[PDB]
Amino acid sequence: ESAGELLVATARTQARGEVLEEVRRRVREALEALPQKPEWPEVVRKLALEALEALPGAKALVANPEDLPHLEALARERGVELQAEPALRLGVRAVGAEGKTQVENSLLARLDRAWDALSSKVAQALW
């Protein structure tokens, strides 16, 4: 008779997982709606500043295939700004250090790094 309780537990788990997955899909859409927002020229600069402060002695920055002038306005801080057409994900897509060895990434799809830790919080928020 453990089959019924097993089924109930499995159905409850499946419902919770499906709802959390939908939450993630909605968040992906919302983050992907950033670029045309007026706060976007601010968030790109904040991403770049975080990336540079995290990596001292950086050599280069990459940016949108648009060659974002908002990020170009920081040309008086570091050396070179390069364009990254393939690097589509919004934000600062790489920070080439002075040695070619190390790169930095402050960019959207940091949701992947944050979701693992805020999933419990949103789960208790829902229920």
């Binding site: 975080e50 070619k100 060895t101 190390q102 790169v103 990434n105 402050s106 790094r113």
Partner: peptide
């Protein structure tokens, strides 16, 4: 915290071990 730092510059792969340079 939410920053993603990558390291290239692998110099040695043998068995289960892998040496990455820089990366202090």
């Amino acid at each position: 915290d939410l920053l993603k730092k990558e390291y290239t510059g692998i110099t040695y792969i043998s068995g289960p071990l892998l040496f990455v340079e820089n990366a202090k």
